[PDB]
Design a protein around this motif. Structure first.
Motif, PDB file in Angstrom:
ATOM      1  N   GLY A  81       0.782  -1.220   0.000  1.00 23.31           N
ATOM      2  CA  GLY A  81       0.000   0.000   0.000  1.00 23.31           C
ATOM      3  C   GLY A  81       0.819   1.277   0.000  1.00 23.31           C
ATOM      4  N   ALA A  82       0.129   2.410  -0.064  1.00 22.59           N
ATOM      5  CA  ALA A  82       0.763   3.712   0.081  1.00 22.59           C
ATOM      6  C   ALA A  82       0.795   4.128   1.553  1.00 22.59           C
ATOM      7  CB  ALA A  82       0.014   4.749  -0.733  1.00 22.59           C
ATOM      8  N   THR A  83       1.734   4.989   1.898  1.00 23.58           N
ATOM      9  CA  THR A  83       1.755   5.575   3.224  1.00 23.58           C
ATOM     10  C   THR A  83       1.737   7.090   3.096  1.00 23.58           C
ATOM     11  OG1 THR A  83       2.834   3.724   4.313  1.00 23.58           O
ATOM     12  CG2 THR A  83       3.024   5.881   5.358  1.00 23.58           C
ATOM     13  N   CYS A  84       0.588   7.661   3.427  1.00 20.96           N
ATOM     14  CA  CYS A  84       0.322   9.081   3.288  1.00 20.96           C
ATOM     15  C   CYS A  84       0.513   9.789   4.626  1.00 20.96           C
ATOM     16  CB  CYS A  84      -1.110   9.287   2.793  1.00 20.96           C
ATOM     17  SG  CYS A  84      -1.587  11.014   2.674  1.00 20.96           S
ATOM     18  N   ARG A  85       1.456  10.709   4.680  1.00 17.50           N
ATOM     19  CA  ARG A  85       1.779  11.401   5.917  1.00 17.50           C
ATOM     20  C   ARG A  85       1.076  12.771   5.987  1.00 17.50           C
ATOM     21  NH1 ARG A  85       6.354  11.562   4.621  1.00 17.50           N
ATOM     22  NH2 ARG A  85       6.587  13.809   4.210  1.00 17.50           N
ATOM     23  N   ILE A  86       0.362  13.016   7.074  1.00 15.49           N
ATOM     24  CA  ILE A  86      -0.311  14.288   7.276  1.00 15.49           C
ATOM     25  C   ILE A  86       0.293  15.022   8.465  1.00 15.49           C
ATOM     26  CG2 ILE A  86      -2.462  15.390   7.959  1.00 15.49           C
ATOM     27  CD1 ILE A  86      -3.858  13.094   6.454  1.00 15.49           C
ATOM     28  N   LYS A  87       0.731  16.260   8.241  1.00 19.19           N
ATOM     29  CA  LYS A  87       1.434  17.053   9.252  1.00 19.19           C
ATOM     30  C   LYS A  87       0.550  18.172   9.828  1.00 19.19           C
ATOM     31  CE  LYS A  87       5.367  20.278   9.566  1.00 19.19           C
ATOM     32  NZ  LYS A  87       6.473  20.861   8.755  1.00 19.19           N
ATOM     33  N   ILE A  88       0.296  18.089  11.130  1.00 17.54           N
ATOM     34  CA  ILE A  88      -0.565  19.048  11.811  1.00 17.54           C
ATOM     35  C   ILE A  88       0.159  19.716  12.971  1.00 17.54           C
ATOM     36  CG2 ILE A  88      -2.668  19.336  13.113  1.00 17.54           C
ATOM     37  CD1 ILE A  88      -3.874  17.058  11.681  1.00 17.54           C
ATOM     38  N   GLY A  89       0.089  21.041  13.037  1.00 14.60           N
ATOM     39  CA  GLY A  89       0.671  21.784  14.148  1.00 14.60           C
ATOM     40  C   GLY A  89       0.084  23.175  14.331  1.00 14.60           C
ATOM     41  N   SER A  90       0.501  23.862  15.377  1.00 13.68           N
ATOM     42  CA  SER A  90       0.108  25.253  15.517  1.00 13.68           C
ATOM     43  C   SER A  90       0.702  26.059  14.372  1.00 13.68           C
ATOM     44  CB  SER A  90       0.580  25.818  16.852  1.00 13.68           C
ATOM     45  OG  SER A  90       0.281  27.197  16.940  1.00 13.68           O
ATOM     46  N   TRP A  91      -0.082  26.982  13.824  1.00 15.58           N
ATOM     47  CA  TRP A  91       0.403  27.804  12.720  1.00 15.58           C
ATOM     48  C   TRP A  91       1.278  28.967  13.183  1.00 15.58           C
ATOM     49  CZ3 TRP A  91       0.974  26.010   8.197  1.00 15.58           C
ATOM     50  CH2 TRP A  91       1.249  26.841   7.107  1.00 15.58           C
ATOM     51  N   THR A  92       0.866  29.655  14.251  1.00 11.61           N
ATOM     52  CA  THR A  92       1.567  30.867  14.702  1.00 11.61           C
ATOM     53  C   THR A  92       2.207  30.774  16.084  1.00 11.61           C
ATOM     54  OG1 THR A  92      -0.416  31.969  15.534  1.00 11.61           O
ATOM     55  CG2 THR A  92       0.115  32.306  13.256  1.00 11.61           C
ATOM     56  N   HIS A  93       1.835  29.771  16.868  1.00 17.25           N
ATOM     57  CA  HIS A  93       2.382  29.599  18.209  1.00 17.25           C
ATOM     58  C   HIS A  93       3.552  28.633  18.289  1.00 17.25           C
ATOM     59  CE1 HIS A  93      -0.725  32.020  20.155  1.00 17.25           C
ATOM     60  NE2 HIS A  93      -1.634  31.372  19.447  1.00 17.25           N
ATOM     61  N   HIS A  94       4.709  29.132  18.687  1.00 11.05           N
ATOM     62  CA  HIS A  94       5.884  28.279  18.866  1.00 11.05           C
ATOM     63  C   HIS A  94       5.829  27.361  20.095  1.00 11.05           C
ATOM     64  CE1 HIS A  94       7.292  31.076  21.944  1.00 11.05           C
ATOM     65  NE2 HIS A  94       7.144  32.068  21.081  1.00 11.05           N
ATOM     66  N   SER A  95       6.904  26.606  20.310  1.00 14.30           N
ATOM     67  CA  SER A  95       6.904  25.506  21.276  1.00 14.30           C
ATOM     68  C   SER A  95       6.772  25.922  22.736  1.00 14.30           C
ATOM     69  CB  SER A  95       8.158  24.663  21.108  1.00 14.30           C
ATOM     70  OG  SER A  95       9.288  25.410  21.489  1.00 14.30           O
ATOM     71  N   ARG A  96       7.105  27.165  23.027  1.00 14.20           N
ATOM     72  CA  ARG A  96       6.947  27.668  24.391  1.00 14.20           C
ATOM     73  C   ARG A  96       5.509  28.153  24.685  1.00 14.20           C
ATOM     74  NH1 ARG A  96      10.500  31.870  25.710  1.00 14.20           N
ATOM     75  NH2 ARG A  96      10.068  32.659  23.598  1.00 14.20           N
ATOM     76  N   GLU A  97       4.663  28.188  23.653  1.00 17.98           N
ATOM     77  CA  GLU A  97       3.265  28.574  23.812  1.00 17.98           C
ATOM     78  C   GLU A  97       2.310  27.396  23.599  1.00 17.98           C
ATOM     79  OE1 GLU A  97       2.937  31.948  21.077  1.00 17.98           O
ATOM     80  OE2 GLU A  97       3.626  33.305  22.678  1.00 17.98           O
ATOM     81  N   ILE A  98       2.505  26.657  22.513  1.00 23.47           N
ATOM     82  CA  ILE A  98       1.726  25.437  22.261  1.00 23.47           C
ATOM     83  C   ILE A  98       2.610  24.229  21.964  1.00 23.47           C
ATOM     84  CG2 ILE A  98       0.212  24.225  20.674  1.00 23.47           C
ATOM     85  CD1 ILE A  98      -1.492  26.616  20.438  1.00 23.47           C
ATOM     86  N   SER A  99       2.320  23.128  22.644  1.00 20.65           N
ATOM     87  CA  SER A  99       2.943  21.862  22.336  1.00 20.65           C
ATOM     88  C   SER A  99       1.854  20.884  21.881  1.00 20.65           C
ATOM     89  CB  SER A  99       3.691  21.333  23.557  1.00 20.65           C
ATOM     90  OG  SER A  99       2.808  20.697  24.456  1.00 20.65           O
ATOM     91  N   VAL A 100       2.144  20.112  20.841  1.00 23.41           N
ATOM     92  CA  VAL A 100       1.205  19.120  20.338  1.00 23.41           C
ATOM     93  C   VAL A 100       1.742  17.728  20.596  1.00 23.41           C
ATOM     94  CG1 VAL A 100       0.113  20.459  18.515  1.00 23.41           C
ATOM     95  CG2 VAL A 100       2.333  19.343  18.125  1.00 23.41           C
ATOM     96  N   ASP A 101       0.855  16.814  20.963  1.00 25.89           N
ATOM     97  CA  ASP A 101       1.241  15.445  21.217  1.00 25.89           C
ATOM     98  C   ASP A 101       0.131  14.513  20.793  1.00 25.89           C
ATOM     99  OD1 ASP A 101       3.219  16.787  23.392  1.00 25.89           O
ATOM    100  OD2 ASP A 101       3.866  14.745  22.953  1.00 25.89           O
ATOM    101  N   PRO A 102       0.501  13.313  20.339  1.00 26.01           N
ATOM    102  CA  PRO A 102      -0.467  12.271  19.987  1.00 26.01           C
ATOM    103  C   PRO A 102      -1.137  11.725  21.243  1.00 26.01           C
ATOM    104  CG  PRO A 102       1.692  11.867  19.001  1.00 26.01           C
ATOM    105  CD  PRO A 102       1.881  12.903  20.051  1.00 26.01           C
ATOM    106  N   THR A 103      -2.109  10.838  21.066  1.00 26.17           N
ATOM    107  CA  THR A 103      -2.728  10.155  22.195  1.00 26.17           C
ATOM    108  C   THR A 103      -2.610   8.629  22.091  1.00 26.17           C
ATOM    109  OG1 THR A 103      -4.672  11.168  21.146  1.00 26.17           O
ATOM    110  CG2 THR A 103      -4.302  11.613  23.484  1.00 26.17           C
TER     111      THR A 103
END
Ligand SMILES: Brc1ccc(N2CCCNCC2)cn1
Ligand SMILES: Brc1ccc(N2CCCNCC2)cn1
Ligand SMILES: Brc1ccc(N2CCCNCC2)cn1
Ligand SMILES: Brc1ccc(N2CCCNCC2)cn1
Ligand SMILES: Brc1ccc(N2CCCNCC2)cn1
Lengths: 196, 202, 199, 201, 202
Positions: free
Chosen positions: A129-151
């Motif tokens: 199969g194919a492996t399609c990667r989707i990248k999601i993050g804060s657009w304007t907030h850097h790492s000291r303001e927003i951190s994203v994590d999986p569940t």
């Protein structure tokens, strides 16, 4: 406090423009795939439908013999400015735009979204199969303001032309030319194929 | 001052309708296109479908604040800010803004806005499938503000470009112009971004 | 007066819902199409997809200000101004406005609005692929205001060299027409676009 | 009273959410379709794409004013007026309103609204390419207001595009009062029968 | 009380943001699909384009009024009412609402809302062109409200309002109610499954 009071308070004191940072806001992101609608191996574009499960804490919403939760129009809440980097259409939000707020200030928002992406569609019609990667993050907030994590397929349509082989999630911190700070993202790898 | 206070002040006090002219000097706007993807090219019709971050930069002093013991920056809904009325002259669809429409405001009044945009253009697609590639001229400038109110200036090419595009970027050059149009006596500034790209081989 | 003051006043006193008629007389609207591109033509369906600057000009005295020591012009959101209810009779899509929706207001109350618009039209596309080309007639006028309230009048330079088409000629004709529904006459400008495919 | 005053009064006083019922009689709405163009036809799917002026007329006394020394009419944003909740039963797209959404209000409270609309319909397209042609029936009525609240009544090629691939043979209008299973009351509708046929290149 | 008073009252005091849950019990919502048309079917992609009246019914006591000498019902813009956050799970386009968005309110607080909707679905289209036909399953339920807050239940003839000019015909419509849990959440959420059995006409 009844629901009406709770919802009134959140509305009048709601500060949507204001990131609820305590003394970065930890945002949890997870994609629950529902359907894959079109695929194009030539153009490397896919049309996907997924629940975008988003989770964070806004203490300014909290409250003390009352309901434990309410549903709140997201227009009345601060919401993290998450975007899909490789999306090639703006997200079509399919469901009512309501968040769920718990008395302690935790927020769940999980709209169903249809969106087209640019990603690796090669191999879609093979065993592996194919492996399609989707990248999601804060657009304007850097790492000291927003951190994203999986569940993988729990909510996936049996009537799709395709099937899901695997979904993996990876977290990243990236420095972009434009700015000195690092911005976090989650990368969701969707491994799928056309069905026999 | 905390973020809430800063954002409240901006909300109340910012004037989205008012060009932040200083002493009747033009607002200096910086424009730069960071190309992300090329989606559908048509050599017959001379039309391209492009996705790019439109990096826009300027100063609005009326937003500034004493950051001695305060945050240095905040993210602000552009609906609460004055924004330059930039347009792509040769765009043939209205810009589809893909990202949250937030600007970034520094305590001294400098503003970054960099939305990701998908937009179709009319330009020279000839040669797209050759060694030399096509060179597509995208022209962006203020729509209604002349050179004494708004001035536009340019600021890796493929740094953010999708490896999965059918195309590749050979070069990007930026040229600045000042143009007088038949409708009006004044001169209006524009930046011309020349995108040189080609189809990738088999 | 600085720009901020002028814009504060305009926003505080603008009546966007009110046609600025000088006594009993009609507001004189000037309309002119500056064609930018022709994108798609269909000689079978007689439909064209066009991009043009719609240059619109009129006077609203209620916007005027003493510019003795003040800016002579400002850019104003059209949502803050009265705008003539112009429509293209033979448009078959609602107009896609491509540019920021800002008008330009002069201290004496003159208003320029010139958005770039993409719109499809129904018109004569026959002959588009001949040396003499097609002649596509576009009719634009006030939708609800008659001639006593609104009058419209005409006013390749900006045409894309990369279009599959070329412009042979543009002529403008003004008309006053009586419709079944209403007793009054309504004015319109007819812009005749003469174009063809290139070699 | 000048235009500004009239429009201010209407803006501040009129009530769009409120059906302008006079004497517990139904508001008499007049509907008439002025066909402008037929853009695409599909005899297989039985779907047509049409453009028409939807001429709508009714009385809202609460808008009236003493016009002794004042303008007799004004144009008013329909968002500031009560408008009848008319819908085309067999429309298969929501109506694309092509024109500025302005109504015309006369000093006595009469209202004209006539936007140009592009909309697609499901109807009988059979025979479109013959001499008698197809007859495409369009049904319009109040969506939520029954016959004691709203009544609809009627009033071809005059405004029809010479550049359409089609031509209009006839237009007839029929008025009905229908009781739907869902509800006890009767709801009125107007049926516009559009008789048209393909021209030939 | 005249219509104007009732509507002033509803508008002035109605909380669209607030679920009208009487004494801790869930709001009982009734849902029924009245199919009007089937516009395009794709047996390959398993996608259908459907037009249906979405008949929705519930009680909001906060709307009620003493109708002793007053109108028994009014039509109200749904933007002025609380409405259940129903969604079609397997819809692949957002619902196109074809009709004016008015609800009908009875003096006792009963609400009817029945817009005509065009929406596309992903479901089993296999067999559409055979005797027994295809059976396309549409799942509708509250999006955010669990079974203690909202309960959904089904409400006659499948084809009563169905277009005679459709390329298709309706063989049967059956409605099934379920109670399902989800990963994010501990509570159960109710849904109604409408099974549409249809096929190509002769
Ligand atoms: Br304003 C502003 C600042 C930075 C960005 N980006 C750069 C930082 C990481 N996300 C990608 C977009 C966008 N807008
Ligand atoms: Br209002 C107003 C004034 C000038 C222009 N144009 C002419 C000068 C530069 N951009 C092209 C549009 C448009 N609207
Ligand atoms: Br209200 C109202 C009155 C008249 C018209 N039309 C007829 C007069 C000329 N323009 C075409 C539309 C439209 N709305
Ligand atoms: Br609320 C409400 C009640 C009834 C209807 N309809 C039934 C009556 C006539 N038109 C079809 C729609 C629509 N909304
Ligand atoms: Br907020 C919020 C909470 C739960 C859900 N979902 C789970 C419950 C049933 N509907 C599917 C979505 C969506 N948004």
């Amino acid at each position: 406090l009844d629901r009406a009071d709770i919802l009134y308070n959140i509305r009048q004191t709601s500060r949507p423009d204001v990131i609820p940072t305590q003394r970065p806001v930890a945002v949890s992101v997870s994609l629950k795939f529902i359907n894959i609608l079109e695929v194009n191996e030539i153009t490397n574009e896919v049309d996907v439908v997924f629940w975008q499960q988003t989770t964070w804490s806004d203490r300014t919403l909290a409250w003390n013999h009352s309901p434990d939760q309410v549903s709140v129009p997201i227009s009345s809440l601060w919401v993290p400015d998450l975007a899909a980097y490789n999306a090639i259409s703006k997200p079509e939000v399919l469901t009512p735009q309501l968040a769920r707020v718990v008395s302690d200030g935790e927020v769940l928002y999980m709209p169903s979204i249809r969106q087209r992406f640019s990603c690796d569609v090669s191999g879609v019609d093979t065993e592996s199969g194919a492996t399609c990667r989707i990248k999601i993050g804060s657009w304007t907030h850097h790492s000291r303001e927003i951190s994203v994590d999986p569940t993988d397929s729990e909510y996936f349509s049996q009537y799709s032309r395709f099937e899901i082989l695997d979904v993996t999630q990876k977290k990243n911190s990236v420095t972009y030319s434009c700015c000195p700070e690092a911005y976090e993202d989650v990368e969701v790898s969707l491994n799928f194929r056309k069905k026999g």
